[PDB]
Design a binder for this molecule. Sequence first.
Ligand SMILES: *[C@@H]1O[C@H](CO)[C@@H](O[C@@H]2O[C@H](CO)[C@@H](O[C@@H]3O[C@H](CO)[C@@H](O)[C@H](O[C@@H]4O[C@H](CO)[C@@H](O)[C@H](O)[C@@H]4O)[C@@H]3O)[C@H](O)[C@H]2NC(C)=O)[C@H](O)[C@H]1NC(C)=O
Length: 266
Amino acid sequence: HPICEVSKVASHLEVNCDKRNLTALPPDLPKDTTILHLSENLLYTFSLATLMPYTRLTQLNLDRAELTKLQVDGTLPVLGTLDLSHNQLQSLPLLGQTLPALTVLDVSFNRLTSLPLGALRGLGELQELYLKGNELKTLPPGLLTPTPKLEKLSLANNNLTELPAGLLNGLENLDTLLLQENSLYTIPKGFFGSHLLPFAFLHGNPWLCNCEILYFRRWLQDNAENVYVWKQGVDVKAMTSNVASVQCDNSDKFPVYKYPGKGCPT
Ligand SMILES: *[C@@H]1O[C@H](CO)[C@@H](O[C@@H]2O[C@H](CO)[C@@H](O[C@@H]3O[C@H](CO)[C@@H](O)[C@H](O[C@@H]4O[C@H](CO)[C@@H](O)[C@H](O)[C@@H]4O)[C@@H]3O)[C@H](O)[C@H]2NC(C)=O)[C@H](O)[C@H]1NC(C)=O
């Protein structure tokens, strides 16, 4: 209570423990805390089990806290949001068995180089997954099979060279897909299925414009109003779409949706 800032009234009880050189969870915290901020601390190691006493905790922010090892012990039955962004995790924590009600997971800007087969098992309620700014080169097929309710997916600014065929199949609620600034060369045929994807970011990739890019070319033409350019700190309020941002070899004068495709089968 005295160490961190507390704010109550209606909605819930938010506890702010940011920037306090904390190396562990303060033993002095309101048992009814619903939102806990532990950002900007020195949590090289942290154990989720230490939060079990706080039964109403629905949001936990452990971002920018030098997090290196996250111990996933017991169970936090009502935790809905977990922010682990801007930390030093080299492996994705396996959270399914501990955070069954999780809807938002942010592990952006960590040190991930790959994702395991078990990755998202058990996170059936997941709605937002952010993995921007890591160094992923490829994704396991079936990565998103445990998360059919996904609405937002961010794989921006990684090192992806290709996407698994079928990655989006089954995601009938997907509204935002961020894939900008990777090393993507093509899009698997039928990748987007028959689902309407309102916000897609595909710029900053060295698209290879050959006959294999024709599926993507047609999709871009049919979805020109759903393609956008990312702008830090700004909501896609009504931001003007810009299909021309998706370019062959990331060359400004050669947008993929204008690629002629000379010498290519129908
Ligand atoms: C994941 O993706 C990251 C983003 O592309 C990537 O980071 C880039 O890495 C390259 C290679 O290390 C960086 O390029 C070098 O930059 C330094 C300083 O800016 C230059 O001195 C250096 O000189 C050139 O090196 C060439 C060989 O690579 C050589 O042929 C040239 O003659 C010349 O000597 C490079 O230009 C680049 O800046 C990084 N980008 C950023 C924004 O950090 C990661 O390496 C990649 N991760 C993995 C695992 O591949």
